[PDB]
Design an enzyme around this catalytic site. Structure first.
Site, PDB file in Angstrom:
ATOM      1  CD  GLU A  35      50.032 -20.472 100.285  1.00  0.00           C
ATOM      2  OE1 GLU A  35      49.885 -21.564 100.292  1.00  0.00           O
ATOM      3  OE2 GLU A  35      50.640 -19.856 101.248  1.00  0.00           O
ATOM      4  CG  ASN A  46      48.027 -26.989 107.625  1.00  0.00           C
ATOM      5  OD1 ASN A  46      48.684 -26.824 106.582  1.00  0.00           O
ATOM      6  ND2 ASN A  46      46.782 -26.130 107.919  1.00  0.00           N
ATOM      7  CG  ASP A  48      47.757 -27.486 112.915  1.00  0.00           C
ATOM      8  OD1 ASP A  48      47.234 -28.042 111.982  1.00  0.00           O
ATOM      9  OD2 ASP A  48      47.524 -26.385 113.569  1.00  0.00           O
ATOM     10  CB  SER A  50      44.388 -26.811 110.781  1.00  0.00           C
ATOM     11  OG  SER A  50      45.774 -26.611 110.552  1.00  0.00           O
ATOM     12  CG  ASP A  52      46.628 -24.430 104.778  1.00  0.00           C
ATOM     13  OD1 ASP A  52      46.288 -24.157 105.944  1.00  0.00           O
ATOM     14  OD2 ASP A  52      47.715 -24.719 104.540  1.00  0.00           O
ATOM     15  CG  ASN A  59      45.570 -23.165 108.976  1.00  0.00           C
ATOM     16  OD1 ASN A  59      44.518 -23.837 109.691  1.00  0.00           O
ATOM     17  ND2 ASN A  59      46.940 -23.495 109.112  1.00  0.00           N
ATOM     18  CG  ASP A 101      47.305 -11.499 111.635  1.00  0.00           C
ATOM     19  OD1 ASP A 101      48.390 -11.163 111.233  1.00  0.00           O
ATOM     20  OD2 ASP A 101      47.295 -12.922 111.562  1.00  0.00           O
TER      21      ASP A 101
END
Length: 129
Positions: A35, A46, A48, A50, A52, A59, A101
């Protein structure tokens, strides 16, 4: 801060990630390697809109507020900037929510593609833990 491999393994172990939801410490070190290269300051945008943040590239779409991710959640109840600290507490505490999650560490595309099914124990080899 750029952690050493064993330095991050020790910090992650101290913050209770070793076998958290059954994921051995090598899984978390492997994820941080691919990462962020162990860099608390890593950020990446990202497709979209967003972003990180930090050692585990958490995110802004779901987990943190960066003030610029329209129609996103802040499920870790933190500013994304807290994920960039030299102190990994907020990153660890937020990662514990993420991995709980339902999708476990598959929430980290880099974990699934580079760590899953590999000899992750190699990432803590030689470390005083």
């Amino acid at each position: 801060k750029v952690f050493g491999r064993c330095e991050l393994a020790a910090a992650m172990k101290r913050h209770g990630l070793d076998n958290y939801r059954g994921y051995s410490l090598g899984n978390w070190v492997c994820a941080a390697k691919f990462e962020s290269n162990f860099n608390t300051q890593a950020t990446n945008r990202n497709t979209d809109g967003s972003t990180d943040y930090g050692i585990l590239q958490i995110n802004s779409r779901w987990w943190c507020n960066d003030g610029r991710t329209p129609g996103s959640r802040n499920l870790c109840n933190i500013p994304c900037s807290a994920l960039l600290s030299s102190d990994i507490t907020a990153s660890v505490n937020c990662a514990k929510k993420i991995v709980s999650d339902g999708n476990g560490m598959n929430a980290w595309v880099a974990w699934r593609n580079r760590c899953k099914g590999t000899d992750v124990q190699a990432w803590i080899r030689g470390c005083r833990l």
